[PDB]
Amino acid sequence: MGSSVYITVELAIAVLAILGNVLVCWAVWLNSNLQNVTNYFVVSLAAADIAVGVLAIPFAITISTGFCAACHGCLFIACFVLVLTQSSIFSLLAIAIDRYIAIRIPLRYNGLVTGTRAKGIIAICWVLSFAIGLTPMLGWNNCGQCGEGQVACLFEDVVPMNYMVYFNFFACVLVPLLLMLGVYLRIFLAARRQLADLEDNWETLNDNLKVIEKADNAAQVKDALTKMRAAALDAQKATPPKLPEMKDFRHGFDILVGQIDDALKLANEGKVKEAQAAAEQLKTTRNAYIQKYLERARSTLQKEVHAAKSLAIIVGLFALCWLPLHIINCFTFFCPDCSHAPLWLMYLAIVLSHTNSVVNPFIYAYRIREFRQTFRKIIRSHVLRQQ
Numbered sequence: 001m002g003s004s005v006y007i008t009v010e011l012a013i014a015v016l017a018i019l020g021n022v023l024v025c026w027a028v029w030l031n032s033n034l035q036n037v038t039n040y041f042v043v044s045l046a047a048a049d050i051a052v053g054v055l056a057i058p059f060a061i062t063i064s065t066g067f068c069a070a071c072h073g074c075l076f077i078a079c080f081v082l083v084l085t086q087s088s089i090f091s092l093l094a095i096a097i098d099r100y101i102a103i104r105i106p107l108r109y110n111g112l113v114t115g116t117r118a119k120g121i122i123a124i125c126w127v128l129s130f131a132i133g134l135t136p137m138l139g140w141n142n143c144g145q146c147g148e149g150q151v152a153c154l155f156e157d158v159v160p161m162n163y164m165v166y167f168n169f170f171a172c173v174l175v176p177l178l179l180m181l182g183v184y185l186r187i188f189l190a191a192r193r194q195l196a197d198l199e200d201n202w203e204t205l206n207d208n209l210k211v212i213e214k215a216d217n218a219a220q221v222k223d224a225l226t227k228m229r230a231a232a233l234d235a236q237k238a239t240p241p242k243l244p245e246m247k248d249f250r251h252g253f254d255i256l257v258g259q260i261d262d263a264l265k266l267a268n269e270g271k272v273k274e275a276q277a278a279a280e281q282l283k284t285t286r287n288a289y290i291q292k293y294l295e296r297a298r299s300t301l302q303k304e305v306h307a308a309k310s311l312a313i314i315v316g317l318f319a320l321c322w323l324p325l326h327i328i329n330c331f332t333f334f335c336p337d338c339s340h341a342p343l344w345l346m347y348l349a350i351v352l353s354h355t356n357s358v359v360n361p362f363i364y365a366y367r368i369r370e371f372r373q374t375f376r377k378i379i380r381s382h383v384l385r386q387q
């Protein structure tokens with residue numbers, strides 16, 4: 001029977017959505033390291049994911065087939081998952097904003113994103129999600145056309161199809177959904193490419209520094225030095241130290257290149273052994289002046305890629321799960337002449353949306369390493385409090 005597989009899966013998902021996200025909250029709370037403000041919103045997301053696994057899913061199973069209830073009451077069952085959805089779109093929105101305010105402006109952050117302003121941002125969304133989510137209950141419903149005073153609750157017969165498309169989807173979801181991927185797919189892409197270039201330069205001058213020490217004639221030296229001077233110049237304009245004022249950075253490269261030129265001058269003059277002797281100085285010159293920034297830059301990007309990629313995946317799946325259900329509501333509203341999407345497809349669109357509140361923990365398990373071994377960290381944190 002298909003109906004059992006539905007309720008079987010519906011309950012199965014509800015279990016994971018609860019257990020998965022509840023684990024996140026323990027790690028976010030038990031583990032001290034995972035207590036960064038960015039996880040404050042991770043909790044708001046997991047809290048909404050928990051509410052979906054507890055209340056939303058049962059509410060869905062019931063309205064799946066309809067039921068007799070008041071119009072002012074049945075809107076809760078049908079339009080409660082709406083609040084949890086907008087809350088998610090608000091939580092992801094914050095994490096996307098919290099991560100951007102730290103990638104492009106790592107300076108004015110700890111004075112810009114305090115623990116208190118964050119706590120207020122979350123509540124203002126839930127009360128605004130309750131407002132956006134439970135909007136049809138203010139007096140925008142189709143329960144006009146059971147017992148005395150009760151109306152047949154079936155969603156599409158109660159929820160205005162123009163509220164799910166124009167407002168909920170377009171304004172409250174589609175706008176924010178596109179807003180986040182377009183930014184972090186670029187940040188993840190620009191960073192992805194930028195990190196690759198920075199390494200090819202560090203490796204090309206690190207490699208060509210060796211070809212000079214073990215070189216035969218003056219040609220090999222003149223050619224490597226040229227390739228080195230290319231990498232240094234490329235790296236020079238590629239590693240801005242955030243923050244021309246107070247930059248002991250442009251001086252660094254100009255000390256390095258200054259010796260590459262003296263070396264090319266040596267090689268060009270046919271002084272190979274004398275030119276390769278200056279190559280060892282370059283190692284010392286690289287380690288002394290430039291090595292500091294090469295590493296500092298390669299680290300900042302490894303965080304941009306891992307964070308944008310992570311946040312992109314979270315938002316990526318969130319948009320990949322909630323779109324089919326919104327696409328149907330669009331193909332249904334803009335083409336009333338089209339046959340309404342079949343239940344077997346409608347059901348499949350509802351079931352998928354419930355999964356988004358399950359992947360988040362899995363994503364964190366496949367991405368956040370701290371959250372991963374956080375159990376062994378909680379244990380050790382307790383056994384240590386014994387001597």
Ligand SMILES: COc1ccccc1CNC(=N)c1nn(-c2cccc(C)c2)nc1N
Pocket residue numbers: 060061063064065078081082085154155156164325326329343346347350
């Ligand atoms: C017959 O199909 C079902 C299967 C399981 C449970 C309920 C139903 C009835 N459909 C619905 N309640 C239903 N929700 N939608 C919906 C669309 C976007 C966002 C949110 C939160 C909800 N869009 C709908 N059509």
Ligand SMILES: O=C(O)CN(CCN(CC(=O)O)CC(=O)O)CC(=O)O
Pocket residue numbers: 033034036038039099306307308310311367368369370371
């Ligand atoms: O989801 C993200 O934005 C990426 N992580 C960054 C990675 N995390 C986990 C880790 O790699 O240790 C850093 C952290 O929590 O210490 C943000 C966050 O920490 O909340």
